[PDB]
Amino acid sequence: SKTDFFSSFEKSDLQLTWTNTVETDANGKKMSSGIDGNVKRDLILGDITDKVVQVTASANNPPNEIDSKLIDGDPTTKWLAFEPTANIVLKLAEPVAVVKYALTSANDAKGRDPKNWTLYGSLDGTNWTAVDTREGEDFKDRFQRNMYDLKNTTKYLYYKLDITKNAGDSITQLAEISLSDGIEVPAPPPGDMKSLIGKGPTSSYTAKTNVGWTGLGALNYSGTHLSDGRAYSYNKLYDVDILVTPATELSYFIAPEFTDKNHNDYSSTYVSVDLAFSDGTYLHDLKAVDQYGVGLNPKDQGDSKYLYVNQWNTIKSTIGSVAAGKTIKRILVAYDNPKGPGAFRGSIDDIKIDGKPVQKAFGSPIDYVNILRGTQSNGSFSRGNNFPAVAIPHGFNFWTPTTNAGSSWIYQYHESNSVNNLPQIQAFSVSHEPSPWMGDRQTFQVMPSASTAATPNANRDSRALEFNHANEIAQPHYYSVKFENGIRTEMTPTDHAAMFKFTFTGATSNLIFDNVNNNGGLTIDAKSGEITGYSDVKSGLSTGATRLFVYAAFDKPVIKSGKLTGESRNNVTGYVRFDTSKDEDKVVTMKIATSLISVEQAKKNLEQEIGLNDTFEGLKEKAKTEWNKKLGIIEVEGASEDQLVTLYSNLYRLFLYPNSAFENVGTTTDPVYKYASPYSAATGQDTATTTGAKIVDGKTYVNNGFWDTYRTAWPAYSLLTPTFAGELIDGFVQQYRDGGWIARWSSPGFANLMPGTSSDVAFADAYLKGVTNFDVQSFYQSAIRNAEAVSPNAGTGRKGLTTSIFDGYTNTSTGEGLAWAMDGYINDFGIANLAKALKEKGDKSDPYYANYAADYQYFLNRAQNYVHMFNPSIEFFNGRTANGAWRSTPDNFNPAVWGSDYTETNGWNMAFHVPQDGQGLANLYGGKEGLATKLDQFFSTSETGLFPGSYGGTIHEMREARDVRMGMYGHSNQPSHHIAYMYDYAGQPWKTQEKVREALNRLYIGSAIGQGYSGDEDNGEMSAWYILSAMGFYPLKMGTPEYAIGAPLFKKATIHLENGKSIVINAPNNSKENKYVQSMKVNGKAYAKTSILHADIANGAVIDFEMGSKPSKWGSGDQDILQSITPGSTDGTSLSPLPLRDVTDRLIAAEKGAVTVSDEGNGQLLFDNTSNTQLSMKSKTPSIVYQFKEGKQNVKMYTLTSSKASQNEDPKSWVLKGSNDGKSWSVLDQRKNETFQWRQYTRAFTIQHPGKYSQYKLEITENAGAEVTTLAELELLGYDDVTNSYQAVYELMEQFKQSKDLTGPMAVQLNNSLTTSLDHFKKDHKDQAIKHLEDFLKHLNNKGLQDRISSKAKGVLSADANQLIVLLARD
Ligand SMILES: OC[C@@H]1[C@@H](O)[C@H](O)[C@H](O)c2nccn21
Ligand SMILES: OC[C@@H]1[C@@H](O)[C@H](O)[C@H](O)c2nccn21
């Protein structure tokens, strides 16, 4: 007998042996329980409709208004045909004598209702006996059901409703048909689970509905799970005789569907293909496993959560492993689910059994790369939302097929398939799209055509050419498609150019040129066989995008040529025609290059990169080589095929962005680099052949949202490609030197989207890791501009800075102000560490040098300002209104609700937004244990996607987050990406290990069918998450050169570093299940810590993980956790310490402070916490005095914010003085010859001789030249009196004495030591105050006294004492 079997459930395939039929056991008992297959419906007397197994109408209106809709029991779904007449054929399971039927009219357009019809009956389906005629029928209402009786005792297997006249329209429609046999059943029995050949998915996020995976047919299953507990049904499909061999693979495609309004019932995933063997055993009893390791049985399919609902899923199982030598007697479909009630529905297509499968071979990393990942994905549900980008790493152009030539939605894997269910290309495009949301720009289009008409038609629909994915090769360096009609197109990239081979079958062959829309030009010089063009195409968010120029040449004479018309694209549509009658002329080659400078430059770009000697194959090899140099930085052992696809495709995505936007205007020997600026104003107007944009010397790179890429991609560069990273960074620093700012979202200029200015942290982070090959000085300037200087541009700097730099938080007056705020504090963390590093560098030629020290202090403080956005009443980060009040209170708050404060997520997902200081974050939650409790709750509460909040309706990010099914964890999007690693701060690293492994395992699947990710990939970010996590470490603390340890994915990984050394990562015992770190070594030596320095791996290292299947305590020690700014000893403090703040804040209004100016101006404008108010003081030489009415203030720093007015009015030299009486002043700080290069720009100064004073005076000794002196704001940055903290501890100690948590000599000794400490503090004896607090701690740990304190009390009092020491040390 045979070893192979295949069904696509087509017309041409074998029909099912049984339909809707349950398999029976050895005893003849149905293998089903608690199931109802019947569709829910309004039943008529003797309703028989459930025996209809097939309905076929003469014409249809796919995707939604097809014959299928006639028996689905929903009046809301209809069949429609664009015809005045038609016939519907109903095939029944068994012959029945129909004696009654009902038609139901549809939703609208009464004229389309049937009016005259005949019902026929048949035995064979070709010879028809009339059984009822109706004429002149009327349906008064929409959704109206008419009932019809007839005499008939003849059992028939087919019924035809022949609709001979409708109600006058040229279109016909009907919502529902029901048939009846006239026999009463007062109690309709449950029917068997449905299993029948149908049209495929009735709903799908990402695929074409009502077609198969391939072809027009599939197997459809559905039913109702009635039971509270287990329900199942194993149904037989096909009678076969198939011998299984050791190598036999079973594969299939399954598309489970949601049957509920809420898209929360996952029942449809509890399904698999099953086999009945001749020996009386079933595949579901053997330990067959899929490509993910999941049992190939229904229960394990559903429990393991690898099947996505409303999407197609590829499944593959080597049943040979477990069933070699058995014979398959029947193929089954099985549903089996432990819990309900619920309901399910889905499709299976392409059940294949292959006795001798051929495995794919791979010669090098690039052979693993599928550039189609992220294309069975759209705006309803993303599996990456990429496009098939062919390019060199970081190339100047992308090249790509498009199935939608008007759109930034460039290529659909399945969604836009033809009536024959094949994809259609409409063009090959030059592209610069960073994402579909940002949109495409600078595009240009060609399409081959075998048209013989006088003129090739340039209409998108009519020129489109169908193809099969099996005939398409899609790689970074090579794309190839063979179309159904015999044409082949192949392309390969250069940096600025590309080569295409068009191979034809006919005598007359054409290339059609076109564009996304009419905003460009085409010039065809037929005589020299050249194309010339320009493109102004640019999406809404393509801010600063300039004109692109195109040049192209052919290897064959062009015989006919010209402009085309009729598409409303007359500026861009034309063609060239070639004589390809002779065999050696059947392939035509086009060489094509692009420029943002000029047509002349496009020409020069082409000559530089495609010499006369270059061939298609030579260029392809050059591109393959450039990709392998990137892909082969990482080499792993033990990986499956699926893992290597994911790994190497991830590395491709990582290096696809960002992109060169500069050109070589000199020669290959002597390069001269220049770019057209999307950053500053155009020099002048464009011409057809030359750009008007400013031509700027040097390099630049583009296409990057820092809100995405800072998390993973940028640190990936700094680790994997240190040297190139610096060239990339400098190309972004260029944006500062040119346009004044570094882009927040470069697309290619300053596009306005997403919160934060994370170039700050990304580039700071890179520098501190030893990527020093860029203009750090300018970078720094751009960072402080982001951090200190209000932006006039919508697309640059930090929104809400007007108030936020003074308030310590960003208020709800800025959209998603919380989001701006939290990312602000992380950026400040990086700016601060860089300032420290530049201080230590000591470059005295840096004009800014004297200022680094101060900036470190000020910025490290700002990094801790997260406290100002932590709402203590709900224990979540939360917005504040302008007046200071929390947005939410316990009564109204819901952490499940998306939006408002929370960009593209909910409060849950922003609960942990403090990667720069985990201990500080833990403290807000009560300590490490409190942090862990919060995370646990996060990971065990399911995201339902039902809470859109401010988004109004469902956005795709919500569906994706829902389908992660890791509690609330939104791995589908960037703002959650740090969360799994936060367990390293809580001292539970095993939970990080668990979550990271689930993420790597389940959320990067489906590559083979154009899926591959759990949501939008975003310019390398989702990819680098996987690459870094799989190595076993992760840059959690962006802005400081070290990683948090997770666990490696592979038995071995090597990172070949550019300096010739290796990072080897050994985990010989690694496996799907062995996910937990048991112990760890670095360089032969046992390693205890869950952090590792970049400086320890960058010069090579050997890392050994002992992996096992059970959690361990490795890395849970108090000094083994990730360290923070906040000391570990403070864990669990009852105090709420603050970093530097402006101690004048809010005093004036509460009358606890006031201000006087030497000229009697309103000095309140200098302390109102807004740079939108300034004071002009009528003197070159004014004085401001701030008076604290409630005692001495410990001020460490102060800030001056330049005004909006001219720079000449600025302070320039000054003295800050302190006093206690107002008569006698001490000199605290002196500055000379200061400047404020920007407007509304804050500068911070470290007071040379600080102390505690009740009165502060700023005495301006010199200004910048004008007759007046103007400022916007002043601040006195200091700390609260430590005394108030001591007080809070006495208070707490009293609470414990009253509860008897603290008694006897322990109470007394603690009291004494604290009091002696306090007394020393008040006499300015800092060292002695600390020493007595150390005594306090010794008491707490006195062995003789443990029966006098509870653990609760000992714990918090310890933490408090240590917190006090910290408060003291900084005082
Ligand atoms: O083109 C027919 C379409 C229908 O498919 C749709 O259901 C609706 O009834 C309608 N109103 C006007 C036109 N149409
Ligand atoms: O594509 C640009 C931005 C991204 O940078 C970001 O990841 C965000 O999730 C998003 N959703 C739609 C568009 N975008």
Ligand SMILES: [Ca+2]
């Ligand atoms: Ca099929």
Ligand SMILES: [Ca+2]
């Ligand atoms: Ca219907």
Ligand SMILES: [Ca+2]
């Ligand atoms: Ca995103």
Ligand SMILES: [Ca+2]
């Ligand atoms: Ca203030």
Ligand SMILES: [Ca+2]
């Ligand atoms: Ca002000």
